[PDB]
């Protein structure tokens, strides 16, 4: 099940960063002054975003555009701490296995 | 092949209104965005507006008067700029661009003079 | 909006030097910049992408360079066929815009 909701997390982050990064084009472009307005680079920022690196060179400046980011910021936290439970789960069981229980 | 196929002119009567058609060819992308660039005899190059085929959206040039409206056929593969209300400073060579939402203008067409007297 | 400026509007050239035109941005854009070249009564080509990157099609003779506000388009040897205007294209903000456009001359 851990396993399973993890990879289950893996491949919706994925499919999340393709359509933040369509989506957050999408919603930038029309704004002035906005600089995520091209797919290559807007990619490059949902994986920033997911991760929470805080490079802090790309970031949207529009309602919806911050709206996409939310749910890649909250989808890469669930994912990343999905594996987190996943991995303790894991070790957990092993543990009671080297004590014999 | 050629990719952008514009008509060649189109003659418009001063308060009347005109609807260019930008047919594409070749690859097709969803991230594909079609401009229109407005060239006047002896100018230079002005950016009109954007669209994106697979979804309707469209954006406007801000600093300019809002005489153009985009739309866009997804069927013919066709791109659709309504001018409304033309005077004789709307008389220009009208340019469609394909973008791949890269930034660049890979291919244009032909371009569209039109010509705005009674 | 970004603002792109290209002087000098005109540029004169004799044959199989090496000529470089310039394009300065109202702020720092990175190497967000393209060039085209736009011939009478021709529509514009695109000669560089992303300010250094070649375009397939493109003869050689053509490179660019540059980064962050100061960027340029340069033509290593100039021949007749060269002889056109020059726009430079930002797509770092929104909206894109152009240059002013500068027109190369060859004296014969």
């Known amino acids: 099940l851990h396993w399973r909701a993890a990879g289950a997390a893996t491949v919706l982050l994925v499919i999340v960063l393709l359509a933040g990064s369509y989506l957050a084009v999408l919603a930038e472009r029309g704004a002035p002054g906005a600089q995520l307005i091209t797919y290559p680079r807007a990619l490059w920022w949902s994986v920033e975003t997911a991760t929470g690196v805080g490079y802090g060179d790309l970031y949207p400046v529009t309602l919806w555009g911050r709206l996409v980011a939310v749910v890649v910021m909250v989808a890469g936290i669930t994912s990343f701490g999905l594996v987190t439970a996943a991995l303790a789960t894991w070790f957990v069981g092993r543990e009671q296995e080297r004590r014999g229980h | 092949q050629v990719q952008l196929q514009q008509p060649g002119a189109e003659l418009v009567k001063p308060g009347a209104s005109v609807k260019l058609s930008c047919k594409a060819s070749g690859y097709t992308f969803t991230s594909d965005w079609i401009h229109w660039v407005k060239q006047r005899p002896g100018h230079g190059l002005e950016w009109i507006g954007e669209?994106?085929?697979?979804?309707?959206?469209?954006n406007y040039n801000e600093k300019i008067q809002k005489k153009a409206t985009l739309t866009a056929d997804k069927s013919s593969s066709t791109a659709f700029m309504q001018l409304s209300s033309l005077t004789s400073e709307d008389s220009a060579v009208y340019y469609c661009a394909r973008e791949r939402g890269d930034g660049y203008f890979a291919v244009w067409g032909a371009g569209t003079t039109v010509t705005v007297s009674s | 909006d970004i603002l792109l400026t290209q002087s000098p509007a005109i540029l004169s050239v004799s044959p199989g030097e090496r000529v470089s035109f310039s394009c300065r941005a109202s702020q720092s854009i990175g190497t967000d910049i393209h060039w085209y070249q736009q011939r009478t009564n021709g529509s514009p080509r695109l000669l560089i992408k992303?300010?250094?990157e070649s375009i397939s099609g493109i003869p050689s003779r053509f490179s660019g360079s540059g980064s962050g506000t100061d960027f340029t388009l340069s033509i290593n040897s100039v021949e007749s066929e060269d002889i056109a205007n020059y726009y430079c294209?930002?797509?770092?903000?929104?909206?894109?815009?152009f240059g002013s456009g500068t027109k190369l001359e060859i004296k014969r």
């Open positions: 294209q930002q797509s770092n903000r929104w909206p894109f815009t």
């Open positions: 992303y300010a250094s």
């Open positions: 669209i994106i085929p697979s979804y309707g959206r469209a």
